Amino acid sequence: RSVEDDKEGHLVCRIGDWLQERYEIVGNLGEGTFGKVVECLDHARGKSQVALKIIRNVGKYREAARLEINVLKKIKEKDKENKFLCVLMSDWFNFHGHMCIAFELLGKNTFEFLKENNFQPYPLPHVRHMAYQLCHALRFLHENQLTHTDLKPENILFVNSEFETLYNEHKSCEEKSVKNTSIRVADFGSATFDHEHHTTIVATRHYRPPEVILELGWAQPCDVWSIGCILFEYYRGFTLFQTHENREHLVMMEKILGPIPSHMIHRTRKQKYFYKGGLVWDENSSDGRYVKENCKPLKSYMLQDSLEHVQLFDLMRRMLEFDPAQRITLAEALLHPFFAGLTPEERSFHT
Numbered sequence: 001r002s003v004e005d006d007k008e009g010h011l012v013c014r015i016g017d018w019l020q021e022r023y024e025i026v027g028n029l030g031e032g033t034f035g036k037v038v039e040c041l042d043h044a045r046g047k048s049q050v051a052l053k054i055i056r057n058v059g060k061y062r063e064a065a066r067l068e069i070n071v072l073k074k075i076k077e078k079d080k081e082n083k084f085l086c087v088l089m090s091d092w093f094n095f096h097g098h099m100c101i102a103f104e105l106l107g108k109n110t111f112e113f114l115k116e117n118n119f120q121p122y123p124l125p126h127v128r129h130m131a132y133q134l135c136h137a138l139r140f141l142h143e144n145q146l147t148h149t150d151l152k153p154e155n156i157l158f159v160n161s162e163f164e165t166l167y168n169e170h171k172s173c174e175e176k177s178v179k180n181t182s183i184r185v186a187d188f189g190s191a192t193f194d195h196e197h198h199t200t201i202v203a204t205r206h207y208r209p210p211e212v213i214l215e216l217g218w219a220q221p222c223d224v225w226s227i228g229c230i231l232f233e234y235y236r237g238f239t240l241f242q243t244h245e246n247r248e249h250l251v252m253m254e255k256i257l258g259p260i261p262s263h264m265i266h267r268t269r270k271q272k273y274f275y276k277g278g279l280v281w282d283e284n285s286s287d288g289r290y291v292k293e294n295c296k297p298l299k300s301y302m303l304q305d306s307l308e309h310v311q312l313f314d315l316m317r318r319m320l321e322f323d324p325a326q327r328i329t330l331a332e333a334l335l336h337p338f339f340a341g342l343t344p345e346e347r348s349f350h351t
């Protein structure tokens with residue numbers, strides 16, 4: 001059988017086909033703009049379960065995958081015991097122009113799970129455990145001169161996403177509750193070391209911090225801002241910054257978090273966003289009316305008054321500090337009293 005690609009350069013994959021005379025395709029896990037993810041059995045390692053990322057046969061995607069493979073090699077060198085909750089590669093190969101990267105098989109990503117639960121949020125204890133793991137994982141990368149730059153719910157995966165179906169106490173509907181909240185962080189293709197070239201713009205827009213929008217440069221604090229956004233999303237089930245454009249995004253930041261510090265305004269070359277030292281925007285436009293209607297102070301989004309909710313919000317506020325130098329580090333975040341609520345099994349990583 002010939003090797004066939006579709007019109008977008010995706011490999012046409014057939015259940016039963018082998019790659020590298022080794023990986024037997026047994027399931028299709030999903031398709032994205034990069035290519036697809038397929039479930040395989042690895043016949044050279046006792047029919048172990050693999051997720052294979054199969055990249056489009058398109059030069060720019062091939063080049064990007066080669067960069068991801070090289071980042072993944074460096075990460076493994078620093079974490080040989082695979083203790084820091086990252087998804088590391090077990091193999092890679094170029095299959096007729098398609099870069100393929102083999103990973104451990106995991107469950108649903110945390111976005112897909114949320115979507116399959118009709119966007120009903122994760123309970124606070126789940127949020128807390130997921131937060132703890134994220135802070136742990138990224139602290140390790142940060143201490144090794146690495147920044148992820150593209151953290152978002154779809155890049156964070158449950159180890160096993162099996163769930164219980166419960167009747168929602170307070171709503172007229174069912175709810176899916178994950179049985180084990182162990183997660184792993186993936187997708188390191190944009191991850192950048194301190195000594196390497198930093199592009200002006202990084203991150204997916206909804207998780208992108210103000211220093212990037214204002215072109216002030218970025219480093220590890222970029223990831224902490226993303227984490228703040230992620231945790232909000234886990235806790236409410238909707239995006240903190242449901243935005244498509246920079247000026248709008250800044251206005252949303254001001255409505256939710258308070259004024260942008262004047263020292264950042266004075267430094268930015270993006271003066272098009274300001275007039276007389278304040279954000280300038282059209283309150284009567286579609287975007288202006290949307291933000292005025294929908295964007296409220298961060299504390300207004302708390303679902304309950306109790307101590308653990310108050311502490312989550314204190315931590316989130318600190319992750320969402322405008323000034324990246326003032327923003328909480330992950331090392332400090334791990335000392336936050338929010339994490340007093342973890343079970344011993346959660347805290348010691350015996351989930």
Ligand SMILES: CN1CCCN(C)C(=O)COc2cc(ccc2O[C@@H]2C=COCC2)Nc2ncnc3[nH]cc(c23)C1
Pocket residue numbers: 029030031032037051052053087103104105106107109112154155157186187
């Ligand atoms: C390689 N894996 C990251 C790739 C890049 N990335 C984050 C995504 O593509 C996100 O979306 C999926 C991830 C996925 C499998 C299916 C996905 O597709 C969605 C599913 C339903 O509707 C379509 C959208 N990953 C995985 N699954 C299981 N085991 C895995 N091990 C490692 C990964 C992974 C990361």
